[PDB]
């Protein structure tokens, strides 16, 4: 009966070893024979970039009052890939039943839900493209990426606002200030005619020790957010003719603490 109790502890440390099938014989110089290098560490693997969720602005083209003629297009997005599927809130079809997130499952939204804590920075790469569908091409314009800090009152909502800049007599110094802010901890600026890509790293700045990597709601992960906006000319108020391509990786201090268990999954199509 002692042998039946000791063999019942968790982990199977009381099981009887049973003279295994064959032997283990691997040489150190097997990596030089196959594949060149090794893949034994997931922390190194997560530092590569993955395509994710090209960003558009096709949600404000519904109301018949959207500005045209050299306006500013702004999108506010969370700091994390916000896993694929029909998440409860959804940034891609909000004013229609069952909103969804038209994205792809990256290497960050696959290994994360198997954990208890998450902390660290995220790196992004935004690549600009866009046409005019007639009305022969205009210059690219200007692009900015800035942070949105936490404030108890009057914080910026999530995504897809458009602001005008001109009047009967051209540019207005007043409307050009209502479409911007202090940018006291934010903006990185560039001109898209000589540089179309934007590289940025966003720190944690949590005031808490960690967050839940099992979060699914779009707004719950959107507690830390940032914004990408572009200034373009000769736009149309009922069409979406510009977009960004987002590539996401892990920062220099990204951490995952306690491996709890592997959650379920399925095949999702849109």
């Amino acid at each position: 009966s002692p042998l039946a109790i000791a063999g019942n502890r968790a982990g199977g440390s009381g099981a009887i070893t049973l003279e295994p099938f064959g032997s283990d014989n691997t040489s150190p110089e097997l990596s030089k024979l196959h594949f060149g290098e090794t893949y034994d560490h997931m922390r190194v693997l997560v530092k590569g970039y993955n395509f994710y969720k090209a960003v558009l602005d096709n949600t404000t083209i519904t109301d018949p009052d959207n500005p045209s003629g050299t306006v500013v297009i702004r999108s506010t997005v969370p700091d994390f890939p916000a896993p694929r599927g029909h998440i409860p809130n959804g940034p891609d079809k909000p004013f229609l039943p069952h909103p969804e997130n038209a994205a792809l499952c990256t290497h960050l939204t696959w290994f994360s839900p198997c954990y208890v804590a998450r902390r660290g920075g995220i790196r992004w790469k935004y690549l600009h493209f866009g046409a005019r569908f007639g009305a022969t091409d205009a210059p690219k314009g200007l692009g900015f990426v800035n942070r949105v800090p936490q404030v108890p009152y009057g914080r910026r909502p999530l995504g897809n606002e458009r602001l005008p800049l001109t009047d009967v007599n051209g540019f207005n110094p007043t409307e050009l200030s209502q479409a911007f802010s202090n940018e006291n901890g934010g903006v990185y600026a560039t001109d898209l005619d000589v540089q179309p890509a934007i590289e940025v790293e966003l720190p944690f700045y949590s005031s808490l020790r960690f967050v839940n990597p099992r979060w699914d709601d779009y707004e719950k992960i959107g507690i830390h957010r940032h914004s990408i906006d572009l200034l373009s000319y000769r736009t149309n108020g009922a069409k979406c003719e510009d977009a960004w391509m987002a590539y996401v990786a892990a920062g220099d201090d990204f951490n995952l603490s306690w491996m709890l268990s592997c959650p379920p999954f399925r095949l999702v199509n849109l």
């Binding site: 009966s1 039946a4 109790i5 019942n8 968790a10 208890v116 804590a117 808490l208 020790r209 960690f210 967050v211 839940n212 099992r214 979060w215 699914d216 719950k220 306690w258 709890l260 268990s261 592997c262 959650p263 379920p264």
Partner: protein, 140 residues
């Protein structure tokens, strides 16, 4: 106002040599409230797969043995608020008790189980003139 301590659980089983049943008892740390409406929709057999990877214990009915669980204080803050209206204590962990193998009997019909709990390395701080969470007798 605030508390910080570790959980200790203990199970007591009693069954004869004519029963040969098995049961599983698992624990889920802080953060479980978010995935609680969906975890209850999974069949018991598939739930045991995930519970076996978490801090758990196995209950054997052929013998009468099993059950000791030491758990740490995991929280994104320094302490937890125990004053009135707090929901922090009800979000630090969860205990699951579901069947692994159905209980049988060698004939020629009921077993029992009891679980205790207490704390260790207790730290009480922040004196205040505030009443605590409304007391309640355990349901069973």
């Amino acid at each position: 106002e605030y508390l910080r301590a570790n959980l200790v659980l203990e199970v007591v089983v009693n069954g004869g040599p004519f029963f040969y049943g098995k049961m599983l008892l698992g624990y889920t740390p802080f953060g479980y409230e978010d995935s609680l409406k969906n975890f209850n929709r999974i069949p018991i057999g598939h739930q045991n797969t995930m519970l076996s990877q978490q801090p758990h214990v196995k209950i054997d009915f052929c013998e009468s043995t099993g059950g000791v669980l030491h758990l740490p204080f995991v929280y994104n803050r320094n302490y937890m608020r125990i004053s009135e209206g707090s929901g922090e204590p009800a979000s630090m962990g969860e205990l699951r008790l579901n069947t692994l193998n159905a209980l049988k009997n060698i004939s020629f019909s009921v077993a029992t189980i009891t679980v205790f709990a207490y704390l260790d390395n207790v730290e009480l701080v922040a004196p205040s003139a505030n009443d605590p969470i409304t007391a309640q007798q355990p349901e069973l």
